[PDB]
Amino acid sequence: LRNCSIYLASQVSENCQGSLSKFLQMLLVGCGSVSIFNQFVTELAEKFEQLISEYVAYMSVGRIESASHWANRCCAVVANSPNDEKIGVFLGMVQLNRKSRQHMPGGYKKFNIDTENGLAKAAMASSLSTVASNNLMDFCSVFNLIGAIADISACRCERSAITNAFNKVIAQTTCIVPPWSEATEFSDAITKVEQWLKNVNEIEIGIRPSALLIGKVWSRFYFNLNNVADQHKTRLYRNAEHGRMASQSNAAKIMRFNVLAFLHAVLVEE
Amino acid sequence: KIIINLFAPNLPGSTKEDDLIQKSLRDQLVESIRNSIAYGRNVFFVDGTRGAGKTTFINSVVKSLNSDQDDVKVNIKCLPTIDPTKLPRHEPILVTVTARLNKMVSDKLKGYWASNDYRKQKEQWQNHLAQLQRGLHLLTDKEYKPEYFSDALKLDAQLDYSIGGQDLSEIFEELVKRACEILDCKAILITFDDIDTQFDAGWDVLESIRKFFNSRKLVVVATGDLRLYSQLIRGKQYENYSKTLLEQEKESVRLAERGYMVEHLEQQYLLKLFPVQKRIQLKTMLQLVGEKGKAGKEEIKVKTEPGMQDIDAIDVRQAIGDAVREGLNLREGSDADMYVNELLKQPVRLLMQVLQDFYTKKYHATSSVPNLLRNALYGSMLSSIYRAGLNYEQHRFGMDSLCKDIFTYVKQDRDFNTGFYLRPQSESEALRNCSIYLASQVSENCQGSLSKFLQMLLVGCGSVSIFNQFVTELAKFEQLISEYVAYMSVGRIESASHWANRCCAVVANSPNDEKIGVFLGMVQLNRKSRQHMPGGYKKFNIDTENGLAKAAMASSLSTVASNNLMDFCSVFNLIGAIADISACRCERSAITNAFNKVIAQTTCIVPPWSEATEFSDAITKVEQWLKNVNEIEIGIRPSALLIGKVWSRFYFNLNNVADQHKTRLYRNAEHGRMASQSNAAKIMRFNVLAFLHAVLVEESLYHSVSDREYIGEGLRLNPVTSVDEFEKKIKIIGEKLKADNKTWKNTHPLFFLLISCPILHPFIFPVGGINCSVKALNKETSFNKLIDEIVGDKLLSDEEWDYLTKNQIFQNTITSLNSSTIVGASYDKDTPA
Incomplete structure (x- = not known):
């Protein structure tokens, strides 16, 4: 294992050199698959090898279609795990209502994506993840956001392909719970992505990432999402929406620091 | 540079020039061998992927090194390649090497011209051969004898070996040294083939290399699998331990340290025998051409x-x-x-063969395109097909064997959620090699036919996803596979309507949470008269609907006996209805037989894994549709990705339609005029709307007939609880189609043929599922006129359109589903304010 550690470090260094999308799959699929299972090793740890075989077969470790598709599978496992207080603020995502609730104080209501117009509309759907079960649910995760950045950074700069990077997980896939379970303004938005893709194709040439760097970036990123899943979890106040004090926190307050958690992890470790 | 003519006999023995790929690697290897001459074991390992030119490449270096003698300052003579598995089971490798080395020396002796030189060197060769023969017994002795000690002290040898005793390493070193002088060369090349067929014979090869081939005038090029060589070496290091120690020390600590020692012993045995810098891998032709973005190191x-x-x-x-x-x-x-990329990682001799078997047969065709690729892959990649359980005979292949092989592929690859795409993403080569074969097979049969497109869509792709979400809560997992297959008979289907009839028996088999009574692709119907049902008319009636409305409603109704004679009505029956009617001759006398077939009521047994005239007006128009279908279906070019993507969006659409329409069943939900009231009419319409949306969107993005899409730049969402999303796409597609002088019937033939189906017309615009509000009407009206632009016929008149929104006889619209009943529907609640 000591001999395989340095060889695997060379694998990460070689495979992630001269790219940014490839840097993200190791952060998302590589380091993520073991920290997400870290929940599942403190839960049921023979059955351990059965869980390993079932976990990779679910998350498609080794045959990932895209970093976004991994997030959709990663979306369900964080949810189907046993939890407390029946909360929708999971580790890396917020569980949003798909049905109207009676007696909603303030302007709280079922979320509709049509409110966001352009680049907001694109980034709102890229963070969405839908899983089907006996009770169909919906989550909005930072992992889905990264799964789109990796997806975008791996495609061509043509408009015909960029418009496809936003239409891979929204209304096509049908995620099913793991077997170990109990039961035009958008055209201008694409232009913003296209011009930034030009930067990526010429700034990423100088990248030189390491397995340590990808390991450390995910370390801060994963630890942060445990804070938001606990510190921000209890702020479900009636006046939380339109909040401006520190105590006030809503769904927007969750993802604002969840994304900033990702940016800081990239910032501090780089 | 490198040119490969595909009209060649493909004989490896005729590979002389302009018919190989590896010369860049060979000349580096050939010079590397020569580079080590002036610099004492030179062992080069050529790793092979169980055949990628392993035997062909290993022969090429023998040919190249033997020919070049005069030009190079230092030349190499090559022994014939040694196959250790074909040698006698007890002949030492040293004997085999010397026997072949003797002939090369003997042939060179017979090629001399000076008699004195021939006599002088022949005796030296026979003096060294006799010394090796005298000491040859040391290789094979069961015991030592004191009579050998007299031979070990014999120093009468005229050449006076350096160290004392009688060791074959020194004797063979001088024998090779003499052979170099006679052959006028340096570093004779010993070549070994693989040991795949019998890898116990590789121990003789390994031991000979490290014990007798240490001379600087000997260079060895071994071949095989280092995994197999590591297994063989590891087993031998375990035989050094005394058998008593393995029994008297059986605890975990002792056993885990003996394996630790053997692991370290085997690690440096491979490093010493095969140095890393001398190991060479046969680069695949993907590694020689690049990713099409960066300039590769070779051009072919x-x-x-x-x-x-x-x-x-x-x-x-x-x-x-x-x-x-x-x-x-x-x-x-x-x-x-x-x-x-999959075909660029295949063996070089394999990709040429399938390429040769494709273009040569395609040239004869120029004097179907998919079967040419299929026949090219089948004739060269049959090893993986036989080793995967799929059909491996050319004549039998049809629309019935396709379903089972794809089902077998999904089961073997264990990807039940996205495996129907036939994505070459497996971990085993054999499973990957079957994905490309099925994709060619999918496009072989579905091409030029609308029915086989739906049959593959329904029976083929459908069986993968309906199983995952509904026949996996139970699992003897493999036992559930066989009877599930035996239920709908994906191996042999009498028709597509029978698959849909049993499809409802599977979806409705899965219970619904909180007992709503609505399932994935359908909604339940209550045969018994519900007591004092509020609002609307009675439950339902097949006879009520008019000539065409009854043609679709009855055809979409299936009866299954499970705890009662339970009634089902699904879009899957509607899709199955199209395939039987479409797959028939245009003669109306035969059409009606295929038409009454999909409407004649039948009963389907509960799944084993469970606990339990005016009707001829529509027959006239379907003949006109079938006349249109017989020519527009020719231009379709379906693909494994297209049919998989059509179902994938159609699957999520049906999941969301039932998820949101379950809670919209109210006292006043009938005769829906706003989005919040959804009866059985509104549920079934969106099921039909889901099918048309899936075909339209995917055909724009993945159909091969069009080089570019016409969706534009926007979010593609399914038409659930609304029609604008489906209405918007038709407008954008239509706007871009006319400006580019392209018609719907040539750009989207599948959607054009499905939107023109007479059967689906009484379902696209039902009485109770228009939810015609003030804003909905604007989108609904534009939706209707846009449709009438594609099909070219307004199925409902403007008088009929005003009838729905305003709250006589309607042939083209169902009239009973507006106030229909649903099993498990709670009619004690009503619409809020």
Whole structure:
């Protein structure tokens, strides 16, 4: 294992050199698959090898279609795990209502994506993840956001392909719970992505990432999402929406620091 | 540079020039062997992927090194390649090497011209051969004898070996040294083939290399699998331990340290025998051409047709694309690039063979495109097909064997959620090699037929996803596979309507949470008269509907006996209805037989894994539709990705339609005029609307007939609880179609033929599912006129359109589902304010 550690470090260094999308799959699929299972090793740890075989077969470790598709599978496992207080603020995502609730104080209501117009509309759907079960649910995760950045950074700069990077997980896939379970303004938005893709194709040439760097970036990123899943979890106040004090926190307050958690992890470790 | 003519006999013995790929690697290896001459074991290992030119390449270095003698300052004579598995089971490798070395020396002796030189060196050769013969017994002795000690002290040898005793390492070193002088060369090449067929014979090879081939005038090129050599070495290091120690020390600590010692012993045995710097891997032709973005280290062009010029030759990376894009009916993009990556990792002699078996047969056709690719893959890649349980005979292949092989592929690859795409993403080579074969097979049969497109869509792709979400809560997992297959009979289907009839028996088998009574692709119907049902008319009646409305409602109704004679009505029956009617001759006398077939009521047994005239008006128009279908279906070019993507969006659409319409069943939900009231009419319409949306969107993005899409730049969402999303796409597609002088019937033939189906017309616009509000009417009206632009016929008149919104006889619209009943529906609540 000591001999395989340095060889695997060379694998990460070689495979992630001269790219940014490839840097993200190791952060998302590589380091993520073991920290997400870290929940599942403190839960049921023979059955351990059965869980390993079932976990990779679910998350498609080794045959990932895209970093976004991994997030959709990663979306369900964080949810189907046993939890407390029946909360929708999971580790890396917020569980949003798909049905109207009676007696909603303030302007709280079922979320509709049509409110966001352009680049907001694109980034709102890229963070969405839908899983089907006996009770169909919906989550909005930072992992889905990264799964789109990796997806975008791996495609061509043509408009015909960029418009496809936003239409891979929204209304096509049908995620099913793991077997170990109990039961035009958008055209201008694409232009913003296209011009930034030009930067990526010429700034990423100088990248030189390491397995340590990808390991450390995910370390801060994963630890942060445990804070938001606990510190921000209890702020479900009636006046939380339109909040401006520190105590006030809503769904927007969750993802604002969840994304900033990702940016800081990239910032501090780089 | 490198040119490969495909009209060649393909004999490896005729490979002399312009018919191989590895010369860049060979000349580096050939010079590397020569580079080590002036610098004492030189062992080069050529790792092989169980055959990628392993025997062909190993022969090429023998040919090249033997020919070049005069030009090079230092030359190499090559022994014939040694196959250790074909040698006698007890003959030492040293004997085999000397026997072949003797003939090369003897042949060179007979080639001399000076008699004195011939006599002088022949005696030296026989003096060394006698010394080896005298000491040859040391290789094979069961015991030592004191009579050998007299031979070990014999120093009468005229050549006076350096160290004392009698060791074959010193004797063979002088024998090779003399052989070099006679042959006038340096560093004779010993070549070994693989030990795959019998890898116990590789121990003699390994032991001989490290004990007798240490001379600087000997260079060895071994071949095989280092995994197999590591297993063989590891087993031998375990035999050094005394058998008593293995029994008297059986605890975990002792056993885990003996394996630790053997692991370290085996690690440096491979490093010493095969140095890393001398190990060489046969680069695949993907590694020689690149990703099509970065300039590769080699350029390869292929003579597709007989007589291309040197500059008039297409790149092999694009030559595969010409086969992959056209054979699989695949539009150019990212998915087509991943299939050619699969073929670019195949053995070099294999990709040429399938390329040769494709273009040569295609040239004869020029005097179907998919079967040419299929026959090219089948004749060269049959090893994986036989080793996967799929059909491996050419004549039998049809629309019934396709379903089972794809089901077998999904089961073998264990990808039940996205495996129907036939994505080459497996971990085993055999499973990957079957994905491309099925994709060619999918495009082989579904091409030129609308029915086989739906049959593959329904029976083929449907069986993968309906199983995952509804027949996996139970699992003897393999036992559930066989009877599930035996239920709908994907191996042999009498018709597509029978699959849909049993499809409802599977979806409705899964219980619904909180007992709502609505399932994935349908909604339940309450045969018994519900007591004092509020609002609307009675439950339902088949006889109520008019000539065409009854033609679709009855055809979409299936009866299954499970705890009662339970009634089902699904879009799956509607899709199955199309296939039987479409797959028949245009003669109306035969159409009606295929038409009454899909409407004649039948009963289907509960799944075993469970606990339990005015009707001829529609027959006239379906004949007109079938006349239209018989010519527009020719232009379709379906692909494994297209049919998989059509179902994938159609599957999620049905999941969301039932998820949101379950809670919209109210006292006043009937005769829906706003989005919040949804009866059984509104549920079933969106099921039909889901099918048309899936076909339209996917045909724009992945159908091969069009080079570019016409959806535009926007979010593609399913039409659930609304029609604007489906209405918007038709407008954008229509606007871009007219400006580019392209029609719907030529750009989207599948959607054009499905939107023109007379059967679906009484379902697209039902009485109770219009939810015609103030804003909905504007989108609904534009939706209607846009549809009438595609089909060219307004199925409902403007008088009939005003009838629905305003709250006589309607042939083209169902009239009983507006106030229909649903099992498990709670009619104690009503619409809020």
